[PDB]
Amino acid sequence: QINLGPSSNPHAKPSDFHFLKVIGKGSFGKVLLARHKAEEVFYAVKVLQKKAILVLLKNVKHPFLVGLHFSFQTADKLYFVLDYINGGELFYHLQRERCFLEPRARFYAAEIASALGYLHSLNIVYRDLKPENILLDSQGHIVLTDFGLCKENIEHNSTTSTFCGTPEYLAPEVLHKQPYDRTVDWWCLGAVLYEMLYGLPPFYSRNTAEMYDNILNKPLQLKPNITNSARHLLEGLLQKDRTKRLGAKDDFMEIKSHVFFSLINWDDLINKKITPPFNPNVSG
Numbered sequence: 165q166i167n168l169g170p171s172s173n174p175h176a177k178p179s180d181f182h183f184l185k186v187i188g189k190g191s192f193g194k195v196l197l198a199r200h201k202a203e204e205v206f207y208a209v210k211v212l213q214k215k216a217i218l219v220l221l222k223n224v225k226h227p228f229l230v231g232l233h234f235s236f237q238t239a240d241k242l243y244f245v246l247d248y249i250n251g252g253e254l255f256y257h258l259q260r261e262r263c264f265l266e267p268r269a270r271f272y273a274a275e276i277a278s279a280l281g282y283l284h285s286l287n288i289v290y291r292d293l294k295p296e297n298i299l300l301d302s303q304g305h306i307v308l309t310d311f312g313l314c315k316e317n318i319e320h321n322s323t324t325s326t327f328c329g330t331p332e333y334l335a336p337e338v339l340h341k342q343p344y345d346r347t348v349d350w351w352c353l354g355a356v357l358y359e360m361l362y363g364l365p366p367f368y369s370r371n372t373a374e375m376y377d378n379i380l381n382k383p384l385q386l387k388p389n390i391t392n393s394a395r396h397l398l399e400g401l402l403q404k405d406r407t408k409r410l411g412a413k414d415d416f417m418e419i420k421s422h423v424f425f426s427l428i429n430w431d432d433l434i435n436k437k438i439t440p441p442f443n444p445n446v447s448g
């Protein structure tokens with residue numbers, strides 16, 4: 165019997181749902197598209213085996229973090245019932261469009277930044293923001309896929325492939341296996357912004373070992389066709405020494421106040437009053 169916290173529902177069974185298709189496979193459990201038999205609504209359901217576990221859940225509500233509706237368990241499995249986010253992976257749109265213009269990139273970067281700053285205020289670090297974790301909902305707002313699962317208590321294969329490794333943004337300090345602190349999130353934000361503007365992750369190589377070598381040892385080169393403010397922001401977020409990285413002293417306040425983000429009304433942003441730059445052609 166596992167303590168799932170306030171989201172726990174002692175009455176729910178897998179039999180409650182019509183599982184339709186597999187949305188995706190994750191290190192910590194498969195995500196399925198499921199319909200609630202009775203309610204007639206669609207959810208994303210994450211399913212994790214209990215044998216995989218060596219508070220396991222601390223869910224946080226925020227406009228740009230995926231909503232957790234409830235959680236339940238069987239003799240063998242744990243089920244987490246989530247908002248089904250159907251606007252597509254942000255980097256699916258990026259790939260389709262080659263790159264984003266700065267106002268578009270700024271919007272997405274700001275929404276992610278707000279969620280990260282909020283988490284840090286609650287002494288929570290995101291730790292592993294990857295492209296696959298960044299979705300758009302049907303309206304075109306950012307939704308991050310982590311919902312508070314305590315990963316450092318669940319077993320998984322973190323094997324890396326020699327060529328063409330799963331996309332992720334490893335900060336120099338993560339490669340050094342140093343304790344995760346909040347500034348890893350700011351490196352990840354920088355990498356996401358870089359990729360939105362330039363079309364590839366910073367330091368990229370087909371050869372994963374080369375890419376790690378680049379992250380650690382290759383100076384940041386920022387190609388032309390971005391503004392001075394964007395350049396200065398990326399220079400700050402992609403500082404290799406976390407003690408010199410933008411956000412090291414005053415966290416989110418340093419990002420919030422950066423000139424790249426001057427045009428963002430953070431209050432309007434977090435209250436979803438800024439109509440998104442792009443509307444995905446979906447509604448459900």
Ligand SMILES: Nc1ncnc2c1ncn2[C@@H]1O[C@H](COP(=O)(O)OP(=O)(O)NP(=O)(O)O)[C@@H](O)[C@H]1O
Pocket residue numbers: 187188189190191192193195208230246247248249250253292296297298299309310
């Ligand atoms: N609520 C959701 N709605 C739609 N797609 C989702 C949802 N949650 C996750 N996905 C997709 O399902 C896949 C697996 O989820 P993900 O959060 O990557 O799982 P994980 O590997 O167990 N956790 P992490 O270690 O943070 O990646 C990803 O491609 C997500 O984009």
Ligand SMILES: [Mg+2]
Pocket residue numbers: 189190191296
């Ligand atoms: Mg994953």
